[PDB]
Amino acid sequence: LDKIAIDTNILLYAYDNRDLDKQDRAVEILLKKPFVTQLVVFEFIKVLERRFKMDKKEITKLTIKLLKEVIIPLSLHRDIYNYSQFLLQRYNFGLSDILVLSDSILNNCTILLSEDMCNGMIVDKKLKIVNPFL
Amino acid sequence: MIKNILGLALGTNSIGWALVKQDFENKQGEILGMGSRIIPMSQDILGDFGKGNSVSQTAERTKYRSVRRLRERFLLRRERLHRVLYILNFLPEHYASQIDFEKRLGKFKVETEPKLVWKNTDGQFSFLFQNSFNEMLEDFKAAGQELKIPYDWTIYHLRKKAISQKIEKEELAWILLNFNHKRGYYQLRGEDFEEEKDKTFVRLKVDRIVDSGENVKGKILYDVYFENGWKYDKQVVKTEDWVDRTKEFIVSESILKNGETKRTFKAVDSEKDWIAIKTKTEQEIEHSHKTVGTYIYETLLQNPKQKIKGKLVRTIERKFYKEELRQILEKQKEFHQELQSDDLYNDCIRELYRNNEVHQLTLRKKDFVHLFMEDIIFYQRPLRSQKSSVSNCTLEFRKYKGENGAEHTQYLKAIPKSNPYYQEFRLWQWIFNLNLYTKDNDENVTKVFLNTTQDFENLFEFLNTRKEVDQKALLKHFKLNEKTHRWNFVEDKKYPCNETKTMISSRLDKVENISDDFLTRDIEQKIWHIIYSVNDKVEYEKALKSFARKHHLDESSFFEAFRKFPPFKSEYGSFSEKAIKKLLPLMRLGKYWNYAEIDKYSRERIQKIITGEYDENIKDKVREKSVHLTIENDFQGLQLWLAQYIVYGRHSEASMIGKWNSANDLEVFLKDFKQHSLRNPIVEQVITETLRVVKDIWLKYGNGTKDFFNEIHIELGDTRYISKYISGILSNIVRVEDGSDEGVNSKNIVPGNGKITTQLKQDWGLNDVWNDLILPRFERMNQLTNSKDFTAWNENHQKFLPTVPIEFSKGFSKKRIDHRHHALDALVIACATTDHVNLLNNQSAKSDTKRYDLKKKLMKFPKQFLKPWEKFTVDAKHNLESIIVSFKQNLRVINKATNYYEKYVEKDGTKNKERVEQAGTNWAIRKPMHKDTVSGKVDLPWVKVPKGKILTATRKSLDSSFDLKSIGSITDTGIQKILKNYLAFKDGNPELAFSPEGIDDLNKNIEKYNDGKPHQPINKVRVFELGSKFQVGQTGNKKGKYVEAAKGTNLFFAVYEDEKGKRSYETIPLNEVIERQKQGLTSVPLENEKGSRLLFDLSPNDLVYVPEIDENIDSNFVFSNLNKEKISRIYKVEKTSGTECYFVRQDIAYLIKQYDAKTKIGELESQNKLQVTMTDDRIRITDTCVKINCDRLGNINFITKEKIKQIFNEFR
DNA sequence: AGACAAAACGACGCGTCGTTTTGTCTCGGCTCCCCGACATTCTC
Ligand SMILES: [Mg+2]
Secondary structure, eight states, X not given: OOOEEEOHHHHHHHHOSTTHHHHHXXXXXXXXXXXXXXXXXXXXXXXXXXXXXXXXXXXXXXXXXXXXXXXXXXXXXXXXXXXXXHHHHHOOOOHHHHXXXXXXXXXXXOEEEOSSSOTTOOBTTTBEEEOOOO | OOEEEEEEEXXXXXXXXXXXXXXXXXXXXXXXXXXXXXXXXOHXXXXXXXXXXXXXXXXXXHHHHHHHHHHHHHHHHHHHHHHHHHHHTOSOHHHHTTBOOSSSTTOBOTTOOOOSSOEEETTEEEOSOHHHHHHHHHHHHHXXXXXXXXXXXXXXXXXXXXXXXXXXXXXXHHHHHHHHHOOOBOOSSXXXXXXXXXXEEEEEEBOOOOEEEEEETTEEEEOOBBTTXXXXXXXXXXXXXXTTOEEEEEEEEEEOTTSSXXXXXXXXOTTTOHHHHHHHHHHHHHHHTSOHHHHHHHHHHHOTTOOTBTTTBOOOBHHHHHHHHHHHHHHHHTTOGGGTOHHHHHHHHHHHSTTOHHHHHHHTTSOHHHIIIIIIISOOOOOOOOGGGSOEEEEEEEEEEOTTSOEXXXXXXXXXXXXXXXXXXXXXXXXXXXXXXXXXXXXXXXXXXXXXXXXXXXXXXXXHHOSEEOHHHHHHHTTOOTTTEEOSSOTTOOXXXXXXXXXXXXXXXXXXXXXXXXXXXXXXXXXXXXXXXXXXHHHHHHHHHHHHHHTTOOTTTHHHHHTTOOOOOSOEEEEEHHHHHHHHHHHOOXXXXXXXXXXXXXXXXXXHHHHTOOOTTSOHXXXXXGGGOOSGGGOSSOOHHHHHHHHHOSOSOOOOOOOOOSHHHHHHHHHTOOTTOSSOHHHHHHHHHHHHHHHHHXXXXXXXXXXXXXXXXXXXXXXXXXXXXXXXXXHHHHOOTTXXXXXXXXXXXOOOOHXXXXXXXXXXXXXXXHHHHHHHHHHHHHHHHTSSTTEEEETTTTEXXXXXXXXXXXXXXXXXXXXXXXXXXXXHHHHOOHHHHHHHHOOOOSSHHHHHHHHHHHEEOOOEEOOSSTTHHHHHXXXXXXXXXXXXXXXXOEEEOOOEEEEEEEETTEEEEEXXXXXXXXXXXXXXXXXXXXXXXXXXXXXXXXXXXXXXEEEEEOOTTOOHHHHTTBSOHHHHHHHHHHHHHTTTOHHHHTSHHHHHHHHHXXXXXXXXXXXXXXXXXXXXXXXXXXXXXXXXXXXXXXXXXXXXXXXXXXXXXXXXXXXXXXEEOHHHHHHHHHTTOOSSOSBOTTOXXXXXXXXXXXXXXXXXXXXXXXXXXXXXXXXHHHHXXXXXXXXXXXXXXXXXXXXXXXXXXXXXXXXXXXXXXXXXXXXXXXXXXXXXGGGTOEEEOBOTTOOBOOOOHHHHHHHHHSOO
16 A cells, blocks of 8 residues: 655656667556656646657647546645745755655655655655666 | 823733823823733633742643653663563563563563563463462462452462562562552651651540630630540630540650650541551551561451552552562572572673663672662652752852853852851851940940950850850840840840851760860861761761761761751852952951951052052042051951952942843843743733833834933832832833933833822723723623613713622722723823822822922812823823734744753763763644543444544542433443432432442442342442544554543634635644644645635634625725724634634623623623624624734734835845 | 436434533642842941
8 A cells, every 4th residue: 555656757758769668667657547746747748848849739638648547646735835845954855856745745645756866765754765767 | 392201001911001202391292102912811820829829830831740750760660670670581481572672672562562460372361370379369268258359469469478488580570560660658868757756646535524724715625635544735615526536646755854755636537638548557557567568468368349559558658668578589589599690680780780880880799689679669869959050149250261262251159158157257247237235325335345356356256156145145245134235136036156166066065085176167167068068868977987087086976976967958148158258357356367368459459548549449439438447457347348348349239220222232131031030920921021012112113212212101000029120120221321310210210009090090081981982882781681780871971881780790890891901001101290190199298389389280270180282082082992902822832842861972982971962853842732531432332423423431430410311421331220220219319319328328238229139339430421532642552542622722713715705614623733833834724625725724812803794805905094993893712612713802801791600691691702793783703804913012914015025025 | 108307205314503501630748949028237
């Protein structure tokens, strides 16, 4: 029993080809219907528009399809800002990462998956970060 | 001509502040500001501090802390017992399996509750000591009582058996833990009293009462005789309750000097007085002549239904347990070789004190018995040193530079008064203070018998040999007698005469076998230091024997001389030892005086004085007084004043006067204020809040500039403590530095009295503005009671006056039922000039003309006072009908606390005991989390339980208040049946049925009401209740404890709104507030489960505006045009529960009539607070109220454009 | 006529506004520091 959350990295490695192993492990990780934040989808849209220069229509179609079928969005907790400031005193991370962990934690998530953000490090003794591609 | 006036009225929890800008000469002026600050606490404290009953939350916190600390010390004792016994291989395998000995030293493994004897195998519990159980059954069979007894009764059989037989090691470990449970009463000081110490609880019978011929108060007093031949020391009047009455007394007998017992008496009641119970149980144990364990075992043998814990043995001297445990250990010692193996003993010593090799070296010389008894179980820590709290000398200082590069001053602790230095000082001071008078002419007969130095020499030598003198001895020293002379002191009073040295002389005289010169200054001061420092019996006798060895005296009578020295009283002088030692030479005269013993600085100052030259450290008043000090020899017999100045150069304490220049000085003074520096917390809170309020008004109205307050008027209206302290503190701001204003208080500080304020309020029509303001409340009560007794018409004024019926006039005052009476008082005080207070305090003139000018200047022609300005009264109306009352709040839920603890740290290759700070985070809860009573959850098939609620059952005493409805609320059905039968049998009268006699009768005849079936007796029953109770904790058995929220802990009330518009309410209890604030979040969730956005949170003492039924307040703001209809619709939260919030109009202090369940009437119904408005619309406040925010001065605070700029101007 | 939409029935049944009433940890021993007030003497 555990609540799995994920970050922009898993979706980005899922989409790209040149990293066949990373893309694979990402697509199996998407099979367990892992929960997502609204933030993570927002940076997904941003990186698709900046890095991948995809047109708006296709991007919105893909995000709607994934939110409907593969990934399960989670509500934007209203205490995200105070709690993100709480981890700011004890943790050394980029503020966007602090928000994604804040919203994952406030939604009862136990395990988060990504390359970055200090593999294997438990956050406020209630959430863990696991690099799954290794 | 224009003067700024700050008037302050000080109450128990109220500060009334007013600031006005007056021209008395031109008959003008206007009020700038008014307000009242209220510190909420219940009227219980108000009625309690007048008499005094633990009126401090600090004391309650201290009590909880002490109880906890005792608990952890018991735990630590048991913990060390586990460690030692595990080393000894004494704990059983099944038990010791579930104790951690590696990380948590000796603690039970988490989520386990092992018992030493109850072994669990495949989910079943079995006893471990079967053979001892069978032996105890055989003993009971020999006694012939039963054959079915509890297994856990074996402990007393073993404790008796341990005295003279061999028991297995497991029972010994069990017995040791039991002894750790029950330690016993013990006094740390001890000091075994008179050898007889009779103190014997006896039961005596009064034989006869012979009328003693002592006719007092129209009645002749009788004496009392007893069967043993004893007479009651006191007499008796009431014959009926003394004839042949089996009375039990506590008596003390002392062998008097005549050689007879001086017997005392004291009536005492068993089972109701702790001393009587203790003595009776102690005597029952001794008269049995056996250990208390065997006494308990025998009493359980004879009466197997006996309650031991709390009934049979409650409290007995620690000596009993000590002797029993000693006998047990010694008699088990010769059988168990494990108690002699010194290898194991060293192993235990190393385990228990690995970081203290000194203590190991100490206890390596002892054995197991001393380690178990004196070290682990019966180890009582000594009292903490209060020496660091001793006061400081006002003259001697010391300066030093720390690691921070600053120069800060240490302090010199004051001299103990028992020190012979201070003794000689007080004797010299008195000797200079003494002067004789004659009885005949009451003339100053001095300068004849004590004029030359030799007379004072003989006087001092005489006074050294005694300890305290009287009229007689001081007169007879000079040969004078009672009939002709008096000594200028209280004729029948005794004054200290160096008790220390004289009593030392007596004890050194009784020892004998010594030369009559061994008592000198060095020896006396030494033995004083020994007898002052070591206040502990064994240490004290060691020290005395060592002194008798080092100094060539026999240690056979000297220790007997000094073993029963009564310890010194705890008192200290005003000065320190250095200051007294420096001062002593100058008060000296004759042979005890010499110039050589005066230090360099004072000798230099003496040379400067005699030479007549000019120094900056010497004032003109000095030579004015020291004109007679021409020669250095004149520095003989100098008193305290002159010598003190010459030593330290200051004309005693002349104070610093002081002058604050801005609000920064005040705020620094407030920052540096120390807790517990005054009489009691109430006045301290009042003074601190007054200082905060005056700082705020200074900032708001004068912006912290110099001398913005032209004058401050102060008044109070027990509480007199703050009458002078606040005036002294606030004198700094309104003082004048020109030299005209010199004294303890600034001349601008003008306290008044009740006479002035009441005469003014009558003469100004202020009473009229007040009663006009309050009348609507009385009209509301009239319409509520449907009468006309709450308002009285008058024709002299032609209007309705507030009034109360006589039956509701128990303690009424019209003035105490509002909060802005404080503002009224402040305003009337402010306008009262020094002329007014002088006129009304010194009305006695001795001549009409002299005070007639004040009459013409102040009285209307002496009828009424003339207006400060023509618009005074209506302006006062406008001001007072426009006051917001500001209520201080205490929403402390969590705060940070720092923990220091002793521990051995490795530094520079050495283990040193130093103080470590706790790692990690740890919060302190600042509110009582829940109520003390603990209930347990039950499930009853015959009770229907609503969803979301549970049934909790608690034990209660079966007593007179158990009627049929309540009898139906006991969880036990058979008990319900039996109690129903009994209550029916007593005609349905619980008072007769459930009296203690009735309970006894039911217990004796339980067959008659159980349908003939046997049943155990009943004294307490578990009554169940249906409601919402939450678990105390989650660990161990704390998940089975169900409690209720504590008083005053429903502190936040959330109001949310959904998208359409309805308001939803929630009462958020303290628990989730705690973990929310611990997670850094807001106190209340910002959305509810439905997702409705949170409007806001309400707390007790909050303020809301309740708009009219027609107004639509959605984005109103505009809180600057607060007129009277706006301000009358301001409600303060009072309490909260569920979805209900109760409010009181902010201007209400006390309800005219509270609520009584008989008449069923009240100002605000039963709760004394309404969920709705008091006005005729009666609208739910919670559905339309809007939260507001006020400051200390009660001014509304709202978003503005400057504020919206500054929000992120600060971050820019 | 068919088959969906929902009103109607049931005893049953539990929730709900408004107020009132009820229940709420207790006693023992000391020790030692500080302060306050009120009396006397003494210096200024
Ligand atoms: Mg990131």
